[PDB]
Each structure stands twice: as C-alpha cells, then as structure tokens.
Design a protein around this nucleic acid. Sequence first.
RNA 1: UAAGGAGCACCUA
RNA 2: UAAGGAGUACCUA
RNA 3: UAAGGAGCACCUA
RNA 4: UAAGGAGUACCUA
Lengths: 131, 131, 131, 131, 131, 131
Amino acid sequence: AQLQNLVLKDREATPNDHTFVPRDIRDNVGEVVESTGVPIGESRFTISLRKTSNGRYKSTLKLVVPVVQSQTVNGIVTPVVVRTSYVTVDFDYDARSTTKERNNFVGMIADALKADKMLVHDTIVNLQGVY
Amino acid sequence: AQLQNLVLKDREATPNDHTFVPRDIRDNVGEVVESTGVPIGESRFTISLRKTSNGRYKSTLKLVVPVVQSQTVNGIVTPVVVRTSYVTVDFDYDARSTTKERNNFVGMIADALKADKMLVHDTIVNLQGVY
Amino acid sequence: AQLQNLVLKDREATPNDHTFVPRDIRDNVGEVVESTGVPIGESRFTISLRKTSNGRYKSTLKLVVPVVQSQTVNGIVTPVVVRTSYVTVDFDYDARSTTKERNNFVGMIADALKADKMLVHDTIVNLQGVY
Amino acid sequence: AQLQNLVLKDREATPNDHTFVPRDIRDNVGEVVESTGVPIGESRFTISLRKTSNGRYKSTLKLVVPVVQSQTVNGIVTPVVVRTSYVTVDFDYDARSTTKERNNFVGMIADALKADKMLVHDTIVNLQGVY
Amino acid sequence: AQLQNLVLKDREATPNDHTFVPRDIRDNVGEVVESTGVPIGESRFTISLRKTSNGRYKSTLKLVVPVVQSQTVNGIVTPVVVRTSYVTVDFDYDARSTTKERNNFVGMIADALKADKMLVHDTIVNLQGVY
Amino acid sequence: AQLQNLVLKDREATPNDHTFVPRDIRDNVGEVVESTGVPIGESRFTISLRKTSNGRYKSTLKLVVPVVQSQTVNGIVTPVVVRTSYVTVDFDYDARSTTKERNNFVGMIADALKADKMLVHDTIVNLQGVY
RNA sequence: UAAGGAGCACCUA
RNA sequence: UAAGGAGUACCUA
RNA sequence: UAAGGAGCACCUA
RNA sequence: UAAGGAGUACCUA
Ligand SMILES: [Ca+2]
Ligand SMILES: [Ca+2]
C-alpha cells in the first residue's frame, strides 16, 4: 500500500469524484488530501496500521471534510470553516485471521453503510435515534 | 418502531446475506445480531446516537464478527469461537450540517472501504503498512 | 399511541400544516420533528406519560420552534438560530378520573388557547400583563 | 382594566360553557374562577406573565378542575371535592419574537391538544404510553 | 420484541380480548397495561430478560389483575380495588440452548396451563392440593 | 387434584406428547416425571399449593427439562446432561376470589405464552429484550 | 481527547 | 437460592 | 433548570 | 420481598 491517490465518490445526484492526493506520512500515518491550496478547506483522509503488543492487528481510517465559505471583498478572499464532519473507522483483527475472513468482514461493514440500509442510514445520515 | 432487521452482504464469490435480527437496546445502544438459534458466537452489530453538550451529533456503529468452528470433546460436538474481528465507526457531525452533506460524507468513506481502493484495501485487508 | 406523524396547523392567514414526523423515543419520551435536514432548524415536539409513586398520572408535552436565518455565500449556507420559542404543558390526573372527565378537561384548556379568548390571548400572544 | 371573564367550552355532547369570573390577582398572578355561590371545589384558572432578566418573556397558564359531588352525612348534604385534575402551560418567548410567530406558535400547540390528534390525545386523555 | 400491544384472551363463555397497550420501559422491563378508562384497577403485564454472567438467559413475566367494585360512602361512589391476583412465570435457559429447544419448553409449560390438564388446573384454579 | 399422569404437548412440527407419570408427593408437593427409560435426564414437573395465613392461596409449578447427549471417553459411551432449562410459574390468589376470576386469570397468562403473542414469544423464546 | 488496549459499547493515563 | 412474605420487579432469612 | 413531587402558583435536590 | 443466584422447592442480601 504505497501512498498514492485515492478517489472517493459522493452520493450526489450524479456521483462526483473527490480525489485525495498524497500529502505525507507522519509516524506511520498516511495522509491524503483533497485540496484547493488552502490548508483549512482541505478534506483529509488518513490511514494507519499497527500491531499491538498482545498481537492484535489494528488499523485506523479517519476522514475529515470541512465546509468552508469564502467571503470576497474588492478582490481579497477570506475563507472560514463554518462546520466540519469527521468519521473514524478502526479494525481490530486477530493474528490468526485469514484474508478471506478479513475481507468479508470489511465487505459487510462497508455494505452496512449503503443508503438503503434503513436501520443504519436513518441514524448515520438522518440523525434519528433507535427505538 | 425503529430497531429492525439489517442484512449485510459479504464479499464472497456469490455475496452471501447475513441477516441481523434485533436483539435489544440498552442505554440507547441498539443491538441487532445475526445468529443461529444459539446465543453463542453470534455476529453482533450495534448502533447508537448521542447529541453531545457542545451541540454535536455523533453516532457509533460497531460490528463484531466471531469465527466459529465445531470442536469435538468426547463426541460432545459444540460450536465454539476461535477468534473475533471487530470494527468501529464513529461519525461526528455538526448540528448545522445538512442532509446532503452528511449523506455525501458517508458515501465517501463508504467508498473508501472497497475492493478496488488500493491504498485503503491493502491495509485494512492485507494488513500492509503505508509507505 | 404509537409514535407516528403529527400535523399541527398554525394560525397563518390560510392555515399551514406543519408535519412533525417520528424521530425516536428516548427514555419513554417520544419526539417528533418538523425538519429540513438540519438539526438546529428542527422544531421538535415531545410527549411523555408517567405514573408517579403516589399514584397520580402525569404526562408532558413540549414544543420547541426555533427561528433560523440562513446566510448564503458563493453557494455555502450558514444557518443560525436567531431566537427560539418554547412551551410546556403538564397534565396531572387522579387515578380515579374517568375518561370523560379528563377529556373535557383537555377540551377546556385547549379552548382557552383560542385566539378570541381575550384574557389569555393578550398575554400568551401579546405579552401584556394582567391588571 | 385587564382581568375579565373567560369562558371555556368542554368536549361534552353539546359543548358546555364554563364561565370563569375574576377572583383576584396576587403577585401579578391573575386568577379567575368559575363556580356557584360557594367558594369550594371551584375550578380555577390562573395566568401570569413575567419578564426574566435574561430578557425573555414567559407567561404561565394554570387550570385546576376539581370534581365535586354531594355527600350525605346525617342528612347534612354538602358538596365536596372527590378528586382534582391539573394542567399547567408555560410559554417562553424570545424578546425579539414577532406577534405572528408567537401566534402561530400558540396556534400549533393549541392544535396539538385535540380530539383527533391521535398521537397526543391517546396519551393526555387515554393515558397510554408512546411506542 | 418491540414494546407493542399484547392481546390476551380469557376462559370466558365466549373468550374476551383484554388489550394491554404499552406504558413504558424502565430498566429493560417493558410494561403493557390494559385499562378500563379509569387507571385504577388497570391490569399490568410486565416482561423482562436479563443475561446472567454464567451464560444463562433469564426471563421474567408478571401479570397483575385487580378486581374493582364501587364502594359508596355517604353518597360518594368510588371505584376501589377489593383484591388482586398475581402470577410470575419465570424462565431460565442455558446460553448453549437451541432455539427449538426453548420453544418446545415453553410449548409444554404453556400446555400444562391448559384448562383440561386436570392435574394442574384443579390446583391453580380450584385451589386443591396434590394427593 | 389426585396425583396422576400429566401429558404435555410441545411445539414440534407435529406435536409430541411427553407423558409425566407420578413419582411421589413430598410435603404436599407432587412430582410427575417423564422418563426416557434412563432416569438420568428425566424431565420433572412439580406442583404445590399452600395457603398463607393472610388468606392468600399461593401455588407453584416448576418444570425442568434437561438435554442429554452421549459422551464418549475411551470407548465408554455414557449418556450425560449437557444443559437444562427451568421455569417457575407462580400464582398468588386472594382467598376472596371467585372461581371464575381465577380461571380467567390463568386463561390470560396461559394465552400470553402462546406462540403468536410476539411481544412475549420473542423474549421467552428468541431471547430478545423489550424496546 | 487517545494511529490507547479487551472483549459474556467495557477497563487503563 | 427460597412449595419465604406481601393494598407489589419491591422488603425480610 | 427538573418527562421532580402536592395541592385552602406552593414545598423537596 | 427480590427484572438475586445456581450440574436445583435448595443457599446467599
Ligand atoms: Ca393419590
Ligand atoms: Ca419501541
């Protein structure tokens, strides 16, 4: 897994391609950025993999996408983050797990995010409780 | 009411369907497990949603998928858990975010987990660092 | 009383239908929301019913309707609650009360809210004291 | 001046009119009761309006409706209170709200209390929880 | 097991349907009540399930049905509970049990209550001991 | 209530008849057992009725059904109990109750166990809590 | 808060 | 744990 | 503040 | 009295 581009699609009317491009690796944590050239508007996606002491294999994804409005006056722009959204995924695997297993695992949780998975969607997207 | 079934497809040759049926809700943390008639080694999936004081809505998805095989002790065949895979997801949205934003947001990370997304896959599945 | 939609009409020139739709039940307190997709603009209506220890039957309604202006800049909207209005109703009934009784009770207080009930209206709506 | 009569209709077969006549004002809390010549088991309705320091106007309506029946003790027939029903209403408005807002606001909650509003009625009248 | 309505038939000449509507859930203990119109004498049916630490699932049902009669004191008619009947069914399954096993279990115990099983009926209904 | 045979049907595809023959009566506690041919794993159903001093008739039924499997140790086949399921129904009537009242009571509770009463079934058989 | 660590949404700084 | 106890998932051994 | 609890707008944390 | 606890009408608070 060499640091490279990563292109995520959103759920827009006609899917848009957000293209994060390598920014760097700092302490075994890769960062990829979808940017304009201005650090705060940057939506960043990071990823890491560590083997704990007890021998479990953990890895973490983090995606941060800020919403920023740029006020413009006589030519000078003044960006300001008006709100942000963050999400973190953490896989905890067993040193005896097989690739197939792991894969299916991801597959499942990945699938659980789909828009039609009512139970989930209404919460992660519509912010409704469970009851 | 809210808590209902949930079916996740895995990434097998011909994607299987794991049907999680509701189990309970404790502390506004809904659980829905998918299992055989026995309450052992059942793959659980939970979902919660709290609104912090700061005024941020943040929900949590947690999926546990234990691998079970049958062991034989004096002819006493019993299914048992050999190992477990865990994954947690945490969304933290701003109370001023719009449904679209959130949706696209989910959609993206949703996309990030994925057979083809080299960067990510090779790590959360092949357990290979980033370089 | 299963959590369902609830449609309240306002006193607009030609009555408008605000349609609150189920959000969830948290600790025996149902919430229904008239929403846009953005949590703060949400006008919420909650309702509960508890039997006290001494054997009285209490129930509580709460309605919160925020006024929010959305500033828009080059496409990015920035909602902000500029003021809110809250109201709470609490019924305290006796374990020996009959339905008819209770009903009429509600009927009365309900009627007391009408626009033509001068004594009340001038206060709850025009913020005038009594004298 | 301000405190005057107030007539509330109940939900009987042919809606009756309960005419509350003024009684007194103590602490800027106006009371208007509806009763027969005797000061016992009279249904009282009160209304107040204070302006908190925060700069919020909030008024309070309180209605008490006791059920009275005549008991006979040694031929000494006397009406007595067997049980009482209470209901309190609390409006909290923003000192920058407009007459319309407030009116619509009241109108809505006014609407919420109502024979047909299933959700609410079944609870504040049938005393049934929400699910 | 969504807290919902529970309808129970009795052994009357031509079976009556007592409909217990939900009331609430306190500590993972649902409570459905069947009211007359007057909260007093309302029959309550509660239910709960806890999972011990020894891998045992215990479930508890309680049903309570009071008998009410209007007592008259000096022309004051008042409905009151003269006596109540209680019952507590209580299961204790082993975390290793089949879903089928459990069903049959209940099935049997349930059958035992049947009106014709002379052995139990004469005791739980005719108050005879065994001999 | 002569200690006699008690035949219990189960929920099997095509209902089986488990016949509990008497065993004995110890302290006004009858015990009927259904054996396989081998005393071990025999399911026991006990029943008793005591009259408290406060004029309350209490009755208690207990049913126990073990699951047996032949374990093999060095060519030694031995039938053994791997797990058991227990249940304790328990009535508490008032010495002033009608014979009819009691019947209806049982009737209902008995009905509640029915396989279709989703509320209870999912709990006592599918181990789901309430929510 | 944690690229902290566990597992019948828990415990450690 | 109670074929303990009750104007009740609540106390007593 | 309280889905706290009462009753000739009161009292409890 | 216990939505206490169990290779069980039997112990624990
Ligand atoms: Ca005999
Ligand atoms: Ca529910």
